[PDB]
Every structure is written in C-alpha cells, then in structure tokens.
Amino acid sequence: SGKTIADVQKSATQRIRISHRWYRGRRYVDVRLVVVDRDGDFVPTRQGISIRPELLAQVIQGLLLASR
Amino acid sequence: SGKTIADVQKSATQRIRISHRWYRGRRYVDVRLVVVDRDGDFVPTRQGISIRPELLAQVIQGLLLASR
Numbered sequence A, B: 001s002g003k004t005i006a007d008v009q010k011s012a013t014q015r016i017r018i019s020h021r022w023y024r025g026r027r028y029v030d031v032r033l034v035v036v037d038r039d040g041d042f043v044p045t046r047q048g049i050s051i052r053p054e055l056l057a058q059v060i061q062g063l064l065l066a067s068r
C-alpha cells in the first residue's frame, strides 16, 4: 500500500502511522491510526486522513499553533 | 465541545480541522476531516486522529519528513 515515513507509538497496541500513499498519480500523506489485531499484527484502521502535498504546510502550522 | 485551533480548506465541502479536545481532565490534539451535512454546517467524520500532547512533536516531525 504506502511507504512508512514515521510510526508514532501511542501505546503497546496502537500507533499513528504517517506514510506516503500514491493514488491515481498523486502522492498523498496518509496519517492513520494502526492497531494490533487478534493475530498480533498492526493493521490500519479507518481512523485516518489523506493530506495532499499542497495542504501539508498549513496542517503543520496548525499543529504548531496547537502546541503548548 | 473542543476548541478549534485552525481550519485548512481542502474543498468547497471540506476542511481539515485541528482542535483541542478533552476527555475529562485530559487534553488531546485532534486532526480530523470535517464535511458538510446541512448547508455550510461542518460535521466531523471518523476520518481523523487524536494525539496526546507528548506525541505532537513526533507527528510534526513525521509530517515534515513527509514533505520530502
């Protein structure tokens, strides 16, 4: 599917995965909750968002604003 | 409810909203697709992630790395 850029460990069972995912000729930044399933593998969930490259700077500035 | 920090305009009917949200005493940073239900009325979808403040630096770093 997508190439993993960063895996941020939330807990023993959960991570936020930031990946590049190509779709129909555009490279999205996918930010997604991945959780360990009954087999023990982390698997992506539907709790995630696709950021096209032109919005990525605004999203980062938003997170900086949200920092304390 | 939560407090909106920044909205990133994605399409006419969509934004990526960065907000503060709380569970009882605990603050989180939430990044979420919001979309219209009724006219100009932006409701939150399950397409989003919640980040305790101590993970925010790693999410920012991932996103920056994803720009490359």
Ligand SMILES: [Cl-]
Residues within 6 Å of the ligand: A050, A051, A052
């Ligand atoms: Cl898009």
Ligand SMILES: [Cl-]
Residues within 6 Å of the ligand: A052, A053, A054, A055
């Ligand atoms: Cl783009």
Ligand SMILES: [Cl-]
Residues within 6 Å of the ligand: A010, B050, B051, B052, B055
């Ligand atoms: Cl968390």
Ligand SMILES: [Cl-]
Residues within 6 Å of the ligand: B052, B053, B054, B055
């Ligand atoms: Cl924290």
